[model samples]
Target chain A: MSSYSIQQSQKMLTQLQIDYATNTSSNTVVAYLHNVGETTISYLQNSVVYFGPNGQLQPVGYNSGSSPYWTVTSNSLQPGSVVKIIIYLSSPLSSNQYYTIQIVTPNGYTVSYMF
Target chain B: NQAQELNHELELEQLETKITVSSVSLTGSTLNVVLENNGSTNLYDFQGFSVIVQYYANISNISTFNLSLYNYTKNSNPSPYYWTINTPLLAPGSQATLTIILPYPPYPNTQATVVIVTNYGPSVIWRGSL
Candidate 1:
């Protein structure tokens, strides 16, 4: 695994990246996730997430099946594949405020965003 | 041996990436952007594509011009102030259309600047009326 660098035969396949996210609505956000490496990422929606304004950020339950539940377009992310996840929040995102979100994948890949 | 093998794969992938905007038109606030994956690369980085618009918008019955950035959404669930492609991935030599809806309609018959930039810095600019 250490033989390859991201920038990877074994090392590459385990990598994940947060590509893009939709900042349209406050309560509803769509995130684009990419598998930059070779390994197939399973349990795509089974992730630990945190969403809220900078200081108020806190952990939220997996939306796959709560108020802050997230739904994935696909459950398995193949190599070099991109998947979309829609996150619904009970609280509307405030205007003129910066917010943060983190999706901690079960396979050790994590991504955070500020918007 | 591993170092060379890794570099070779990255070099080939980078060299084959190409995205081109073939056509663009706007009716009202929704824009219809036609593009094609000219290069033979599997494009899955949808977030790398930037959609920016410079146009005049009406607010409080007052007209003013400004620049706005559009976020990306899915084709199945397109929203205002967001852009979506026909598919999630653009395979080699595949054609896709981008549907972008602006926050509001621009002045009628007025030309606006619409720019589309794809992954790795290939970009194209077009002028259209909304």
Candidate 2:
């Protein structure tokens, strides 16, 4: 019976924070997310993200399912349905905030942020 | 003669920068820890130094302070002491950051400084978290 929702705006910004947990150079962290309602997730193929003054992007390794996933579940997201976007750094970052992170979903959805 | 020379060299190995604290937190039940590398060159094992954190109900009676190589515990009347973080080895240039939750006894607004004397003397220091 609550009317508050993050999906209120027709155009929303999905921002990902590059925290120490999200930083995978020396360690790895798993992110858990569940679909609230019916969400048509579109995974891109080659999304590119830039960082600092220079424009450098790490390639997308793999995602759970194909692009433009269809809604076929109930209140909870299905197992193996939640996507695991993979990315690897080509070189050691010059400093802590040197490079940035970018991603392209299986379909074409893209989200980029500085790391 | 060679054995004596080796022993002298080994003694020199324990001489390095030591860390000391100049301030502590005012929150009352906080833990302030400092770390120092005891070797001239870079070291990585957590077991390099004799690590200990002591909590005192009385700030001045450190002689009777509780020493632990693992964690620090709080006391209301200045009584308990133990060793907490006994790492196998802490390599050179590496820092150890620990946060111990303890009870704070009643006292005037004061500062608790833990002397981090390495194998040689005091070197690196940290302050606050209470």
Candidate 3:
């Protein structure tokens, strides 16, 4: 519908904290944003960083300039961690544009489908 | 320290994986269900992929279904290992889509929205109860 901003949400890297510690390196984080209206999402266009608490950019571990995908290394992410990444219109997104996120852990692990 | 009970129970709040699923119906077996990176950061590794649909009689109870993806394998989440298919990767602004189909006749005509999630990503669950 309309381009809305994140009013209030959690930005803690609690999960990553665990992954970084446990070094399980076998977990993944994923998300997707589907717009009700038809709009070319300008945020999912290029590269972006993962955010942590206080809006601090955390270690991406791995980054690919696409939605619904990313990779990390063993001993990179521990276990029992939490994370929150922000996406924005670097320029502008079209109406009805749905964005997807697929985070992969070490050993190639995916959560599931979100879009 | 005898004031403290030795039998004290350690209460670990059950961690829930949150996902946000939205959709625009195209037909009986097609809906543009979407997942959003509603959090503040991007996630890595887009693997172990599966789409699960749950039926809810009320907000307190629900049932799960294994939906198939067009380009991915169809898997099931049974008991302990709730997540089924693990894919290669995904990040912020990245998402996956599933062409859902319910073949059962007399299926609940009521509204049912699909929910998507990943293990290590920022867990986001949308208002998918329908």
Candidate 4:
């Protein structure tokens, strides 16, 4: 504990990556996330997803049936395994434009991707 | 002092990590860019790198432009104009060449600006002409 913050440093960081994100349709974006950390993550399904064109993003929670929501392929993700994230947008996205997506687990560990 | 430790960690990485573009080439809409890690820290997570391109393009039926901005896509099985990372991790002094494809070949004398930004905030810009 020198000049910064953290009680147990190891618990504060989790390695996750949104390796690939593809706009499957006008209002749907499918992303694949991998757990590269040493331990298993059990709350993947409850993770929050913030996705949209840059500067205009909205938060989508887990297992919601609304038009603008995100869902996970499975709740438990093991090391070296991947989980599919499906995002349903409220409005259709335009072509030739860039978009960003961020996934935040309950533990506050997050990963983001821009496409 | 936990807060102080995290702050110091960021400062250390920001100071010690670096990325350099050794060479960049273009041949018929294909860009071969070489990146070298010159610092002591290791660079990984190729997916976190952002590729932005600014160049003149001829879209055929769409339109021709003086210069336009486009975001390059990264895929293992890249499509016609997508890009791919040749190596996943770049160690100190190790270099990797990337393959970036544009939609179409520009006429001679056209120039391009390519910016590559890493995850931890260091970025390198490469500009060249055909």
Candidate 5:
């Protein structure tokens, strides 16, 4: 037999707004993952990944395996913890297109943000 | 009001969710099935939640096993085998891990199916081997 309980475990992505004027090789999308869940969660290697339109893809550095374009960030989080991921947008993004970043936990659960 | 209705509709659409098997391992005579909620809706909020586990290896001994559900969020055991949700809600992007302890482990290379039924109108069914 098994037992279970409900806990508040959630992650949110922040700082998603874009500034086209600041576009540069060094300028990156400043974003953070805020853990709102009740338990601690760790980020697996290659867990931070993204996929989207060509405008957002052309500038990123490389792809990880068969998955989408990936940028590397490694860290672990406790309850109410926060971590940052910096994404470099080499070009300006226009409307009618979208970009998404997905964060996968050690248990293979994922939280995705689309912009 | 129309815009609000549209937004509500969108929120409901965003809330659609599903469950999947994360891991299946054996501990002595027990079979532990780890199920994860891979959807956006908070499954705990759905009234009348129930989990049914079906296996093909041994029907004769099914009555001898004990089933139960356990999860990380509440850090509590909510139901016994053939269990239902007594809690009010589970958060979005969270997991409701189920544990099935059998009197004896199934024969080698056995497969199982899990069915999760919720009152809010969705029944998630998954089939796989342990």
Candidate 6:
């Protein structure tokens, strides 16, 4: 019998972008996550997160038991593809308020950004 | 290729209904609102509909502590009433008026945010200030 070596798929987080907006007097932060590797990457919530200027973590507004806080038109992130996640705050936020974001992949890959 | 072509040829047209808050008025403790369907699709019965109203004393007061400001009443529109979608056919471009009796009239200079969530499609939201 011949033995074979197990292979693992490699995932990479290439770029990060943040977008800010106000809706109905509420503050909103949007993040664009880009994956540039050959394999698909996922596992966005609980593992992935955002933080405020005071080192406070931002809570996801529209997450459920079956879904993540970030909204994606399609489920999987293919190579050279990007996904968007939104964070909404109802209270009025000051102009000095800023955010830092962190993404952790299912394979234990991590990426961080500040905006 | 033939199956894909046939599927595209027989694709059904999607129905999209758009509802908007046309007007809102306050009469004593009762709040009246009018909704207009501006899209092509007809809105069905209001059996599973929700009307949420948030009243605030000021723009800065974001807390929902006051019961009067957070009061709400929900029911199925069955017969003749302020909201009469029980006809089972809220045709396109038709206007339907609904009234909600508040526990108490909000104080002067109060602001109100109203949201109407229907069973089908997206919800309609409106804001008004007294």
- Which one is best on TM-score? 1
Identify the runs in model 1 with alpha carbons over 4 angstroms from their true place.
A1-15, B1-4, B11-24, B27-130
lDDT per residue for candidate 4 within B1-130, as digits (tens), equals 9756765675466456678889988777777889999887787766555555656665563334332222334565555546777777888899998777777775566666676655544567777875
Model 6 Cα lDDT, one tens digit per residue, A1-115: 9866764333222222221112223355445454533455554443455445548766443364332244444555654444555655545556676656665655666666565
The 10 consecutive residues of candidate 2 chain B with the worst lDDT sum are: B74-83
Q: Candidates 5 and 6: which is better by lDDT? A: 6
Model 4 chain B poorest 10 in a row by lDDT: B63-72
| Candidate 2 local lDDT, A12-98, one digit each (tens) | 444222222144543222222232324444322322322221232322233325421211122223323444333333334454453
Which lDDT tens digits does candidate 1 get at residues B39-110?
Answer: 878876777566777777766656666556677876556778798888788898888888888877777666
In angstroms, the error of model 6 at A37 is 34
lDDT of 3 by residue, A81-108 (tens): 2333333222233234332333333322
Q: Using Cα atoms with residue i matched to residue i, what is each candidate's TM-score against the true structure?
A: 0.51, 0.30, 0.30, 0.48, 0.35, 0.42
Model 1 per-residue lDDT tens digits across residues A20-102: 45444657776666665555788866777777788788777665456677777788887656666677888888788888777
Docking class of 3: incorrect
Q: Candidate 1 has which clashing residue pairs, if any? A: A4-A8, A13-A38, A13-A39, A63-A69, A63-A70
Pitting candidate 3 against candidate 4, the one with the higher lDDT is: 4
Clashing pairs in 4: A3-B4, A3-B5, A4-B2, A4-B3, A4-B4, A4-B5, A5-B2, A5-B3, A5-B4, A6-B2
**Which stretches in model 6 have alpha-carbon errors above 4 Å?**
A1-115, B1-15, B57-88
Docking level of model 6? incorrect
The regions of model 3 sitting more than 4 angstroms off are A1-115, B1-19, B40-46, B56-96, B103-108, B121-130
Reference-based lDDT, residue A93, model 5: 50
Q: Between 4 and 5, whose TM-score is larger? A: 4
- Report model 4's chain A TM-score: 0.83
lDDT for residue B118 in candidate 4, whole number 0-100: 57
